[PDB]
């Protein structure tokens, strides 16, 4: 390869051209925020539960940002499900529902951000405005709404009008495109089980699994949005994710310290 050959292809071929695609794949790989960790705080699993769930995680965030740069994205939760149900019953398309869901994740970011404001932690659009916060020991963290910006250009699912890329996908893609070192999904279960632990009696805990193994076990759409598992196999920078129970005091702190709490899902 060479820059000259890449620029030649870039000028003279369609971007669809396999030869161009391959030359572009050999480009150097810059990580924009390599030392940051992206954390998703679940909407339904955490923020909808109010103080008993949110206040301990606020404390952990405040303690953790002493030693860890944090990009904290919020899920949407039950109010988004309500909007999806109204809009779906009207026949509205996935692109319209996508905008509705974003407003609920924004609400959750605003509530979490107000609990963190006195600790110096702002609510921002995304990682592109986190540069100053993440360079300051006094700050070292930001809060953002986790919904992707696709709005009316949301790709629909194969079936139904529920946007397939929601806040798990939004947070994952931010960690991936900013080349972050770690992606932690904070939910309300200890991790992945062989069945939904809420509706199954004897589901077995899975500490570590690959995407292929999840698909083969029927877990494609279990504790993460299924599109996320496919994004993870495509990712250049974040090749595994960790799912932890935010309802367990200190679980996020211990995950940031490298403890294998929860479930590690690997691209391969």
């Amino acid at each position: 390869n060479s820059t000259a050959e890449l620029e030649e292809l870039l000028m003279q071929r369609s971007l669809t051209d396999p030869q161009l695609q391959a030359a572009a794949a050999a480009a150097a790989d810059f990580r924009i925020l390599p030392d940051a960790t992206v954390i998703k705080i679940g909407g339904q699993s955490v923020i909808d539960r109010g103080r008993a769930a949110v206040y301990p995680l606020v404390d952990e965030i405040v303690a953790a940002r002493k030693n860890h740069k944090l990009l904290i994205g919020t899920g949407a939760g039950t109010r988004a499900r309500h909007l999806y149900s109204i809009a779906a019953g009207l026949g509205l398309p996935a692109g319209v529902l996508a905008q509705l869901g974003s407003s609920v994740a924004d609400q959750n970011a605003a509530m979490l951000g107000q609990l963190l404001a006195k600790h110096g932690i702002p609510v921002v659009g995304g990682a592109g405005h986190s540069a100053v916060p993440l360079s300051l020991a006094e700050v070292n963290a930001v809060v953002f709404s986790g919904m992707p910006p696709y709005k009316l250009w949301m790709r629909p699912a194969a079936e139904g009008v529920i946007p397939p890329y929601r806040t798990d996908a939004g947070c994952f893609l931010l960690a991936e495109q900013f080349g972050c070192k770690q992606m932690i999904f904070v939910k309300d279960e200890d991790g992945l089980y062989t069945a939904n632990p809420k509706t199954s009696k004897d589901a077995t805990f899975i500490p570590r699994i690959s995407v292929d193994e999840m698909k083969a076990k029927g877990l494609h759409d279990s504790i993460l949005e299924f599109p996320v598992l496919d994004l993870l196999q495509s990712a250049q920078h974040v090749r595994e994710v960790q799912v932890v129970n935010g309802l367990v005091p200190g679980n996020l702190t211990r995950a940031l310290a490298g403890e294998h709490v929860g479930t590690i899902i690997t691209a391969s």
Partner: protein, 244 residues
């Protein structure tokens, strides 16, 4: 299936490489668009063309990831849109930003016969990984919008007659055969370059309304006009949405 938000809308995507040809291509296209304004309600969306290749060259040399390159390319499509809208300003046509297209298109098409916007979708730093080239580009964004709206059609205005079996301007030029009609699924099973995003074929597979998209040569005056009347003057791409 979802209702059609704007069933009377016609969406026209103007290739960035058509715009790249400057006045020689743009002025005839502007005159044709002018004559179309009393006939159709148009959302005219521009692609990016060669300047996005240049910013890809720089950004890839700098090592930037695909989510960094996506808004850089989208900027070029927006610039093409501003240029094209300026040429139609005396007809009441203006460029409208993405949030305006997303939420206020109905009122803007009530105010005037056509608006121009960027065909790129606002995937921004949430573009999908895998390729170092942003996959969701101008064809893809235009189709996503046209299908989301339930528009009466999407016409893709190219600098070639349509889709060939090989790049008609590339090394295998000699064996390039014109395809008057194809399905998205057939195109998706083929390797090799296309005049349309590969992601266009993917979003056609999940489409809810648009049954066919015609790729026509905007360098031939009259083909866009004919295509908007359903005349077969380029390559018809069947999306796999079935008619009633």
């Amino acid at each position: 299936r979802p209702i059609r938000l704007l069933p009377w809308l016609q969406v026209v995507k103007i290739g960035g490489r058509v715009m790249d040809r400057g006045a020689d291509a743009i002025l005839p296209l502007v005159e044709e668009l002018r004559k179309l304004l009393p006939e159709h309600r148009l959302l005219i969306l521009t692609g990016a063309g060669v300047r996005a290749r240049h910013v890809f060259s720089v950004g890839l040399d700098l090592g930037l990831p695909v989510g960094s390159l996506a808004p850089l390319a989208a900027s070029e499509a927006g610039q093409n849109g501003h240029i094209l809208a300026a040429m139609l300003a005396s007809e009441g046509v203006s460029y409208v930003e993405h949030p305006t297209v997303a939420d206020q298109l109905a009122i803007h098409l009530s105010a005037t016969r056509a608006v121009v916007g960027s065909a790129f979708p606002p995937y921004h730093h949430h573009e999908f990984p895998g390729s170092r080239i942003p996959p969701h580009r101008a064809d893809t964004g235009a189709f996503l919008l046209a299908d989301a709206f339930g528009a009466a059609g999407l016409t893709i205005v190219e600098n070639v007659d349509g889709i060939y079996t090989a790049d008609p301007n590339g090394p295998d030029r000699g064996q390039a055969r014109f395809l008057p009609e194809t399905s998205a699924t057939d195109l998706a099973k083929s390797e090799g370059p296309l005049p349309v995003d590969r992601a266009l074929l993917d979003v056609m597979a999940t489409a809810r309304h648009i049954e066919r998209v015609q790729v026509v040569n905007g360098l031939v005056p009259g083909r866009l006009t004919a295509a908007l009347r359903g005349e077969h003057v380029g390559t018809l791409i069947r999306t796999g949405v079935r008619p009633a």
